[PDB]
Amino acid sequence: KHQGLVADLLPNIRVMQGVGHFMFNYYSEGKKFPHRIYCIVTLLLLLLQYGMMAVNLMMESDDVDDLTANTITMLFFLHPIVKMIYFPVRSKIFYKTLAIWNNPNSHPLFAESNARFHALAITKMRRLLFCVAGATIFSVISWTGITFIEDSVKRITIIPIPRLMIRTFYPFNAMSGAGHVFALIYQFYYLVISMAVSNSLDVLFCSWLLFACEQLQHLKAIMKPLMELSATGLTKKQEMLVRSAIKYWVERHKHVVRLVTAVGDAYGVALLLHMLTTTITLTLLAYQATKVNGVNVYAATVIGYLLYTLGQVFLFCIFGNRLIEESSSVMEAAYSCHWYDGSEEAKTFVQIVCQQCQKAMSISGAKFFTVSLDLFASVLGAVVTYFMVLVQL
């Protein structure tokens, strides 16, 4: 919890540890033992509820609509389990990534901009974490309220059904007795924990991306005065200064590239699994939306599911796209200085940088796609087209 890129992200690491995202790496060994059991317990509880959910879906397969709703719930709550199991297996690469920026470069002339942009990155990371936490809390409260404003009823004739936030089969009578209140408490805990683990892993990915983008911003900001330093014939000392500045710029850019590659390594398969689950979720959600008539509870539930799913996709796409834009705009930043007035070394450096910048940095979901607003647009178009085809038929 000391070296760079772990001190900056320490609040997010603490959230993830608190919810149960393992990570037995960033505290004193004294807490190493107890926390572990807590994690296991949480996992077990999750699985328990998940299993008790799946069992319900087995006897809810007589009809199609209830089957569709149960399947959507199961996929939505499969996301967090997949993420929670995914992290520990790849903890090696995750810890390699979190220790990438422990020993960065330094130059006297660019220390001030470096510090300014580091602080800006930290502030942006904290803001993102708080915003996502607020969204998660709002979603939990909305679920816990909608489960009460509506009416619990089963259509066959009318048959009362236990009023619970998540449909589930329980060995006990979870209708009116203390089993009812126990079930509500357990389901509330399940909702909070699942949403927390999923969104916290997503936020860690996005925070890595934000740090990379801010480092690119600093690189451009110092690109502006680097040429002025070169422009000025020149004495040996000035030539050495230009060489050192160019070395600093190139090495910092290479460091940013290393960080981006490590982030991709760490999270590509997670992105692929997320999108695979999403696809089916969105298909079922389009079928469900085909049945909406009015502004009743059903519409609220369908819109909530669609909004949460597309919001996760949209966060990923936003930050991938921002990385792409900064990496590309490096060239514009390099062109707008007085490169024609510099020395031969500076002009060649600008040339090579401009050649390099033609390809934008990006994160690929296991080489099957890249995260960007184009991906979000394609997903949205596909779901809209499928919904139109459904409604026409």
Binding site: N321, Y335, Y340, K347, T348, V350, Q351, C354, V389, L393
Partner: protein
């Protein structure tokens, strides 16, 4: 002088800017708040009543869609009002920079630049006049048709006319209108809102097109300067003079790129909302036409709603395409000079110039995509595919 003269007039007629005819327009908060107050007028007079009628009084899907199309267009125009009010500062700074560039160019001693200047001024004036006049005519006719009907009926049949006047649009208000005073005041506010919306549409579309025209003129001036550098290369002038001339050319290129950047920054969200709404409206109207195909009165309304949408899309697509095309052609212009006659250093500078000039530079729609004519082609292809698939799947 005063680039975008007719655009300044039309903006002033909207109270968007109170001192448009100044060489360096100023952004004053008085205009901001006055324009916000004006923006709230069409919302209350047109948007809300029409939306209420759509939600409540509609009885069938056909009526729903027919009432939904015009309401969507009005909502888009109001959104344009709000977006441009928000981007006031950037838009005004862009206009000021364009004026500065034009003033710098107008001091030229070369007849080619003067001809370019005159052609650009004539083009902008003519385009603004035609577009604004046509849209004002359309909106005034649509709004005031029943007023003219009443006047004609009163003049011809005197007091025996069996004609009762109604408001220009199908809408429902919160209060009654049977009273003459309320009816008259609501009618006046409806006309005020329609006038504001028409001026908004015309003025902002004309501003986008005219800024594109001026950027194109600047690119042509850059082409002329590049050709002059080529002639100086052929004539064989010393290295330092060629360095200076290339430096000036690069500075002009940077200025034009800055202008494109400002235009994109000012109009990205405008274009995104425009394209989204237009495409969705095209799909909806195609569906409606399919449901009411054949010879009948209903087909007429959809046939009228379409062309406005297609032409409005085509305008933006064409001018964004021009921006991209000129920005690209800079590379050809710089390749065609006798650079092989220059010593390697100037050739390397030209190489960096060419590397920069080749990057696709244009106007994006909220960064989702770069707007060009292929965007219109894609929208048309999707519309046709949707139409055919709808016909087949119908039965």
């Amino acid at each position: 002088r005063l680039v975008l003269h007719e655009v300044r007039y039309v903006l002033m007629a909207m109270l968007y800017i109170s001192r448009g005819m100044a060489k360096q327009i100023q952004n004053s908060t008085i205009d901001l708040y006055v324009y916000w107050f004006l923006t709230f007028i069409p919302i209350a007079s047109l948007c809300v009543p029409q939306f209420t009628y759509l939600v409540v009084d509609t009885k069938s899907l056909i009526d729903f869609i027919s009432v939904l199309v015009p309401i969507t267009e009005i909502l888009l125009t109001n959104g344009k009002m709000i977006i441009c009010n928000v981007k006031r500062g950037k838009i005004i700074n862009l206009i000021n920079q364009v004026q500065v560039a034009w003033d710098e160019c107008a001091k030229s001693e070369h007849l080619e630049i003067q001809t370019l200047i005159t052609a650009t001024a004539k083009k902008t004036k003519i385009f603004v006049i035609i577009y604004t006049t046509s849209f004002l005519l359309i909106c005034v006719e649509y709004s005031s048709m029943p007023l003219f009907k009443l006047i004609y009926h009163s003049a011809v049949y005197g007091k025996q006319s069996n004609y009762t006047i109604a408001l220009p649009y199908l809408s429902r208000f919160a209060y009654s209108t049977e009273s003459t005073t309320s009816f008259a005041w609501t009618y006046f506010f409806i006309l005020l809102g329609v006038y504001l919306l028409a001026l908004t549409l015309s003025g902002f579309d004309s501003l986008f097109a005219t800024l594109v025209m001026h950027v194109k003129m600047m690119f042509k001036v850059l082409k002329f300067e590049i050709e002059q550098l080529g002639l100086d290369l052929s004539a064989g002038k010393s290295h330092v003079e060629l360095q200076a001339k290339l430096k000036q050319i690069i500075l002009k290129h940077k200025t034009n790129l800055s202008l494109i950047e400002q235009l994109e920054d000012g109009f990205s969200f405008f274009l995104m909302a425009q394209f989204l709404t237009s495409s969705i409206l095209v799909c909806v109207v195609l569906y409606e036409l399919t449901m009411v195909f054949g010879w009948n009165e209903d087909t007429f309304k959809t046939v009228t709603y379409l062309p406005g949408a297609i032409l409005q899309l085509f305008l933006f697509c064409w001018y964004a395409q021009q921006i991209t095309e000129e920005a690209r052609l800079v590379s050809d212009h710089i390749y065609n000079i006798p650079w092989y006659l220059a010593d390697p250093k100037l050739q390397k500078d030209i190489l960096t110039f060419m590397v920069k000039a080749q990057k696709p530079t244009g106007v994006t729609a909220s960064k989702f995509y770069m707007v060009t004519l292929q965007t219109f082609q894609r929208i048309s292809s999707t519309s046709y595919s949707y139409f055919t698939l709808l016909q087949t799947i119908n039965q």
